[PDB]
Amino acid sequence: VSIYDPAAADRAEEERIERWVEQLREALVGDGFLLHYQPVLNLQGEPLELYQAFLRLERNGEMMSPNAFMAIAEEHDLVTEIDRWVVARAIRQLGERQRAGHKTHLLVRIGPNSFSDPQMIDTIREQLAVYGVPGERLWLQTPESKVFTHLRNAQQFLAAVSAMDCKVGLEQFGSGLDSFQLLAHFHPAFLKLDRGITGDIASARDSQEKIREITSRAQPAGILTMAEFVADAQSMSSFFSAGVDYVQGDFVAPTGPLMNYEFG
């Protein structure tokens, strides 16, 4: 039996957190992370070899989801560095792909801490260059919600990165007037619609209208629209009908290690 010792119990919990933090740092130093890729399919007549990068942690025989560790990472201020890790390895992948004759584009996540992170812009500027990758091959997405609360930094990031010809866009993009207003202050290259809008597109009037409210503004503004978690054929068709440019999700193609999707 283990006799209850509150000080020892709190120590053990912080030891569990500390192990995770230490494992995340070891992963950063030792290349313990890995990217998987999900094909993103163009629906509007402009095939493009595009994948989204998804982060995994290769921990002692387990391919772990960020669901395991991102909360710890956020609490311990490791997200900034993890996002830079991802961006750097994404550019490396873009370079290796290009050298192998593939005009691969990657869509990569960055959080708001990255907007003001000089090392993020340095990583993009320097790694594109060293791999001879045109900036247009790298698309960066950040949640709309984070741009609202870091607008000036987001705008500075957008400008800094756009200067490389990278695309900066918003994920979890909504259909409220606040979203329409944000587009007057922040010009993204692309919008990825929030799943709350898109999930029931095949069956829901209101979702169909939300999407057309967005695409009707996005299209003439030269903003690409995207939907995710596309899970069936009816949904995919509905996005095509609504003028959405891109779709992704397990029905299109599951996430995986390989870039083997035939885009044509």
Ligand SMILES: Nc1nc2c(ncn2[C@@H]2O[C@@H]3COP(=O)(O)O[C@H]4[C@@H](O)[C@H](n5cnc6c(=O)[nH]c(N)nc65)O[C@@H]4COP(=O)(O)O[C@H]3[C@H]2O)c(=O)[nH]1
């Ligand atoms: N977004 C998206 N996901 C799809 C889709 N179809 C299937 N999935 C799977 O569903 C999970 C959705 O998580 P999320 O909301 O993107 O939430 C993500 C996100 O919060 C975080 N995450 C994943 N990859 C990255 C990354 O590269 N960078 C950062 N900062 N966070 C990441 O970890 C969470 C879990 O990711 P996973 O284990 O990869 O698990 C992902 C993904 O593998 C799709 O169409 N779109």
